[PDB]
Amino acid sequence: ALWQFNGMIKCKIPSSEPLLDFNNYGCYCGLGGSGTPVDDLDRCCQTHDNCFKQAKKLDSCKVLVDNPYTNNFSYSCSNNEITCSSENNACEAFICNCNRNAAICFSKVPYNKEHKNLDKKNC
Numbered sequence: 001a002l003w004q005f006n007g008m009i010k011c012k013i014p015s016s017e018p019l020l021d022f023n024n025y026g027c028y029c030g031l032g033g034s035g036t037p038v039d040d041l042d043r044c045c046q047t048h049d050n051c052f053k054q055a056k057k058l059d060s061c062k063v064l065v066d067n068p069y070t071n072n073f074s075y076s077c078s079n080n081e082i083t084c085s086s087e088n089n090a091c092e093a094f095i096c097n098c099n100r101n102a103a104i105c106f107s108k109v110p111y112n113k114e115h116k117n118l119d120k121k122n123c
């Protein structure tokens, strides 16, 4: 889920509005994504995109049929750390981990403004 991904990123980077700051960055952060990641933050998004793609192939996800986009989940944020809930079923848990991994990834890499709003055709 997106709206949950948004909260997860804010947990690690509280000075940020994720849907504004990490959208449309490089070749992978945002809609679609193809080509070579332009920097480490773009690589975080590529990994994320790959993780959701993988989620769709998961039987536990198919056998409920709702998507990486619809499969909700629960997580908690305690002084800048995210915990995916043990109550999450296998599908919700996979998606929560994809999101958690990307949030941690975003907080550990440089943000290069020259890559914001890249012409995705040089991707």
Ligand SMILES: [Ca+2]
Residues within 6 Å of the ligand: 027, 028, 029, 030, 031, 032, 033, 045, 049
């Ligand atoms: Ca993407």
